[PDB]
């Protein structure tokens, strides 16, 4: 099949390039650029600031272009600059000169990745229902491409720590290739503003601010929580990329069967089920005592992704007009998720101190479970009462 294999490999090489930068990002600043953690909380604040003017902006374009590939050409164009970004630009600029004047080099990561990954999901999602395949399939490539690169980072961490970027950049032109050969064949912005007074959006986004925002702030400093339950902070880290690498292969597997499960259960129960798996991880982490316990908890993250990603599209397409699938994705499951993740993280630090780590996860989990249970009623569609 023409589109499936091209855009399936597109995810493979796209997330390979996100898998070098992202899943080990704080370490890069910590060790390899010697940046204090009283300064990395300001870098993320600017990588998430250019993400807020791009994410909605990418949503309207990703619809107005429809199946036109221009917006995805820009991304594949900017991703070629990946190697000389980290190695020669971003790297020396943040340290030697002021962090503020280099925190605007997090514009790059705002465009390509934080606001560009979901634009790739959304676009390939539209193509996913003009060809004959399921979005969960092909998207499953992202996890294994993420896993492949994930291993190589650790495998290459002491050998040549610039290599992952150089290889990453080489895949960007491979990404240009697959974008070209693949062959694939409305609204106005004032109709777009109609959705914001439709009360069916308010309850979808409520679910995101409630369940998904709480979950992604929970997975913020999970690295600090995870390490304590290994004998050495360092040795626990050395087992961390093992879990991440391995569990992502499982994650693709879970996603493999995801769309079949998703297609009948329906969209709403897909999110409710995702919300339950999310809440279970957030609450049950309060009852963590041993390494095996915390390891298995982290693997719930691999049960969670398929249902959230695949499910949200099934929801957005099923209950909303498709003339807005990219927009209400990049505004609800990305923008509104990111906008609320500014504040829910702020008082997650005033809960690390105010009531400890496991006591912080308890407040979050009962807000996560809180809004999961609430969205059986606020979300329109068929609830779990049907089966
Ligand atoms: C504006 C200031 C920019 C400073 C940039 C410093 C670049 C240093 C590059 O080092 C080289 O890296 C290669 C891999 O990238 C290795 O193969 C090689 O052994 C090593 O010598
Ligand atoms: O910028 N974002 O919006 C964004 C970046 C990375 C990301 O990673 C997810 O997909 C990855 C590959 O599939 C892994 O599975 C990972 O475990 C998931 O969390 C998700 C969202």
Curated annotation (Swiss-Prot):
InterPro entries: LacY/RafB_perm_fam (IPR000576), LacY/RafB_perm_fam_CS (IPR018457), MFS_dom (IPR020846), MFS_trans_sf (IPR036259)
Feature type site, description Substrate binding: 121, 139
Reactions listed under catalytic activity: lactose(in) + H(+)(in) = lactose(out) + H(+)(out); melibiose(in) + H(+)(in) = melibiose(out) + H(+)(out)
UniProt topology in membrane: Multi-pass membrane protein
A Pfam family matched in the record: LacY_symp
Outcome, altering residue 216 to N/G: Loss of activity
An example molecular function term from Gene Ontology annotations: carbohydrate:proton symporter activity
Subcellular location, record wording: Cell inner membrane
GO biological process, one term: carbohydrate transport
Residues with site note (Proton translocation): 281, 301, 304
Result when mutating residue 258 to S: No change in transport activity
Cytoplasmic side: 66-69, 125-135, 258-267, 314-325
Annotated site, Substrate binding and proton translocation, chain positions: 248
Transmembrane segments: 3-29, 37-65, 70-95, 100-124, 136-158, 162-181, 200-228, 233-257, 268-287, 291-313, 326-353, 357-377
Function of the protein: Responsible for transport of beta-galactosides into the cell, with the concomitant import of a proton (symport system). Can transport lactose, melibiose, the synthetic disaccharide lactulose or the analog methyl-1-thio-beta,D-galactopyranoside (TMG), but not sucrose or fructose. The substrate specificity is directed toward the galactopyranosyl moiety of the substrate.
PANTHER family: 3-PHENYLPROPIONIC ACID TRANSPORTER-RELATED, BLL5896 PROTEIN
UniProt record similarity statement: Belongs to the major facilitator superfamily. Oligosaccharide:H(+) symporter (OHS) (TC 2.A.1.5) family.
Subunit composition and interactions: Monomer.
Protein name per Swiss-Prot or TrEMBL: Lactose permease
Species of origin: Escherichia coli (strain K12)
Gene giving rise to this polypeptide: lacY
């Amino acid at each position: 099949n023409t589109n499936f294999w091209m855009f399936g490999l597109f995810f493979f090489f796209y997330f390979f390039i996100m898998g070098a930068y992202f899943p080990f990002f704080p370490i890069w600043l910590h060790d390899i650029n010697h940046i204090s953690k009283s300064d990395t909380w300001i870098i993320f604040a600017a990588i998430s600031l250019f993400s807020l003017l791009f994410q909605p902006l990418f949503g309207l374009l990703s619809d107005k272009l429809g199946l036109r590939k221009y917006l995805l050409w820009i991304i594949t164009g900017m991703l070629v600059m990946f190697a000389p970004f980290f190695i020669f630009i971003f790297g020396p600029l943040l340290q030697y000169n002021i962090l503020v004047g280099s925190i605007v080099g997090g514009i790059y990561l705002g465009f390509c990745f934080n606001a560009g990954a979901p634009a790739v999901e959304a676009f390939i999602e539209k193509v996913s229902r003009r060809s004959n395949f399921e979005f969960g399939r092909a998207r499953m490539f992202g996890c294994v491409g993420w896993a492949l690169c994930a291993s190589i980072v650790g495998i290459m961490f002491t050998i040549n720590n610039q290599f992952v970027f150089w290889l990453g950049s080489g895949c960007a032109l491979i990404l240009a290739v697959l974008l070209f050969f693949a062959k694939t064949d409305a609204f106005s912005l004032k109709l777009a503003l109609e959705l914001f007074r439709q009360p069916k959006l308010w309850f979808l986004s409520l679910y995101v601010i409630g369940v998904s925002c709480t979950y992604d702030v929970f997975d913020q400093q999970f690295a600090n929580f995870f390490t304590s339950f290994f004998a050495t902070g360092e040795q626990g880290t050395r087992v961390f990329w093992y879990v991440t690498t391995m569990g992502e292969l499982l994650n693709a597997s879970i996603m493999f069967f995801a769309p079949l499960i998703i297609n009948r259960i329906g969209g709403k129960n897909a999110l409710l089920l995702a919300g339950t798996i999310m809440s279970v991880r957030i609450i049950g982490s309060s009852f963590a005592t041993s390494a095996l316990e915390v390891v298995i908890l982290k693997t719930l993250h691999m049960f969670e992704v398929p249902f959230l990603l695949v499910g949200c599209f099934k929801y957005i397409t099923s209950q909303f007009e498709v003339r807005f699938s990219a927009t209400i994705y990049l505004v609800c499951f990305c923008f509104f998720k990111q906008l609320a993740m500014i504040f829910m993280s702020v008082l997650a630090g005033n809960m690390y101190e105010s009531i400890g780590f496991q006591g912080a996860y308890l407040v979050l989990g009962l807000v996560a479970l809180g809004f999961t249970l609430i969205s059986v009623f606020t979300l329109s569609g068929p609830g779990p009462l049907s089966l």
